[PDB]
């Protein structure tokens, strides 16, 4: 059940995700997956970032569901579930601002 996944935050808003991620205690690459508020049927990978000029900031990556079943952020790689996606991007950033490091708490 994705519901029980530790990195999955269900229906929290865009503003709630940022609130959770923008915190001193979180590594760059702390992240969560949520349903998209605005795009029905989509997801969103929310990742904390930091640059010395803006400080801690969050980047949001829409995750689209292929009708045939998969998930994608880019045309580069596609995956059979959000779990396989969370796992790949933890090993390689491939375009994302930072590799996924920490699950949001």
Tab-separated table of C-alpha atoms in Angstrom:
chain	number	residue	atom	x	y	z
A	1	UNK	CA	0.000	0.000	0.000
A	2	UNK	CA	1.665	3.260	-0.930
A	3	UNK	CA	-0.426	4.626	2.037
A	4	UNK	CA	1.817	3.099	4.584
A	5	UNK	CA	5.066	4.231	2.873
A	6	UNK	CA	7.200	6.398	5.135
A	7	UNK	CA	8.144	8.747	2.287
A	8	UNK	CA	4.547	9.061	1.051
A	9	UNK	CA	2.530	12.047	2.412
A	10	UNK	CA	-0.759	11.558	0.615
A	11	UNK	CA	-2.849	14.650	0.140
A	12	UNK	CA	-0.848	17.360	1.985
A	13	UNK	CA	-0.859	20.700	0.186
A	14	UNK	CA	2.004	22.273	-1.748
A	15	UNK	CA	2.380	24.751	1.165
A	16	UNK	CA	2.327	21.955	3.792
A	17	UNK	CA	5.059	20.026	2.006
A	18	UNK	CA	7.303	23.072	1.972
A	19	UNK	CA	6.659	23.684	5.694
A	20	UNK	CA	7.770	20.187	6.401
A	21	UNK	CA	10.850	20.278	4.286
A	22	UNK	CA	12.184	23.793	5.087
A	23	UNK	CA	13.891	23.063	8.295
A	24	UNK	CA	17.395	23.211	9.624
A	25	UNK	CA	17.238	19.554	10.645
A	26	UNK	CA	16.925	18.361	7.006
A	27	UNK	CA	19.826	17.405	4.696
A	28	UNK	CA	19.799	18.770	1.132
A	29	UNK	CA	17.847	15.988	-0.608
A	30	UNK	CA	15.330	15.365	2.177
A	31	UNK	CA	12.163	14.547	0.169
A	32	UNK	CA	8.599	13.266	0.164
A	33	UNK	CA	6.099	12.040	-2.504
A	34	UNK	CA	2.558	13.406	-2.430
A	35	UNK	CA	-0.496	13.589	-4.658
A	36	UNK	CA	-0.574	16.609	-6.886
A	37	UNK	CA	-3.164	19.202	-5.699
A	38	UNK	CA	-3.576	20.839	-9.007
A	39	UNK	CA	-3.076	17.986	-11.498
A	40	UNK	CA	-5.570	15.122	-10.794
A	41	UNK	CA	-3.956	11.794	-11.383
A	42	UNK	CA	-0.387	13.191	-10.804
A	43	UNK	CA	2.145	12.975	-8.046
A	44	UNK	CA	4.914	15.195	-6.871
A	45	UNK	CA	8.414	14.616	-5.633
A	46	UNK	CA	9.268	17.503	-3.187
A	47	UNK	CA	12.984	17.876	-2.374
A	48	UNK	CA	14.678	20.306	0.072
A	49	UNK	CA	17.609	22.185	-1.391
A	50	UNK	CA	20.023	24.905	-0.276
A	51	UNK	CA	22.107	27.556	-2.084
A	52	UNK	CA	24.085	30.138	0.009
A	53	UNK	CA	22.111	33.082	-1.548
A	54	UNK	CA	18.488	31.924	-1.056
A	55	UNK	CA	19.196	29.495	1.831
A	56	UNK	CA	16.974	26.402	2.177
A	57	UNK	CA	14.480	26.245	-0.743
A	58	UNK	CA	12.180	23.384	-2.055
A	59	UNK	CA	11.983	22.201	-5.735
A	60	UNK	CA	8.868	20.238	-6.850
A	61	UNK	CA	8.992	17.678	-9.706
A	62	UNK	CA	5.635	16.536	-11.157
A	63	UNK	CA	5.461	12.686	-11.464
A	64	UNK	CA	3.222	11.509	-14.308
A	65	UNK	CA	1.520	8.204	-14.435
A	66	UNK	CA	1.698	6.415	-17.762
A	67	UNK	CA	-1.684	4.865	-18.700
A	68	UNK	CA	0.167	1.733	-19.465
A	69	UNK	CA	1.223	1.721	-15.704
A	70	UNK	CA	4.626	3.454	-15.143
A	71	UNK	CA	5.838	6.694	-13.640
A	72	UNK	CA	8.178	9.361	-15.045
A	73	UNK	CA	9.842	12.654	-14.218
A	74	UNK	CA	11.966	12.742	-17.551
A	75	UNK	CA	12.130	10.812	-20.923
A	76	UNK	CA	15.352	9.356	-19.713
A	77	UNK	CA	14.112	6.701	-17.376
A	78	UNK	CA	10.566	5.494	-16.546
A	79	UNK	CA	9.585	3.092	-13.675
A	80	UNK	CA	6.929	0.538	-12.721
A	81	UNK	CA	6.083	2.065	-9.360
A	82	UNK	CA	6.857	5.087	-7.118
A	83	UNK	CA	8.982	2.795	-4.953
A	84	UNK	CA	11.303	2.010	-7.879
A	85	UNK	CA	11.389	5.732	-8.713
A	86	UNK	CA	12.261	6.718	-5.027
A	87	UNK	CA	14.979	4.115	-5.155
A	88	UNK	CA	16.645	5.164	-8.471
A	89	UNK	CA	16.855	8.842	-7.728
A	90	UNK	CA	18.356	7.983	-4.342
A	91	UNK	CA	21.263	6.540	-6.294
A	92	UNK	CA	21.426	9.101	-9.098
A	93	UNK	CA	20.059	12.592	-9.295
A	94	UNK	CA	19.799	12.523	-13.112
A	95	UNK	CA	18.527	16.100	-13.498
A	96	UNK	CA	17.044	16.615	-10.002
A	97	UNK	CA	18.639	19.273	-7.836
A	98	UNK	CA	20.238	16.732	-5.458
A	99	UNK	CA	20.198	12.965	-5.144
A	100	UNK	CA	17.352	11.897	-2.719
A	101	UNK	CA	19.120	11.531	0.619
A	102	UNK	CA	16.772	11.676	3.634
A	103	UNK	CA	13.009	10.767	3.820
A	104	UNK	CA	11.058	13.745	5.207
A	105	UNK	CA	10.230	12.981	8.902
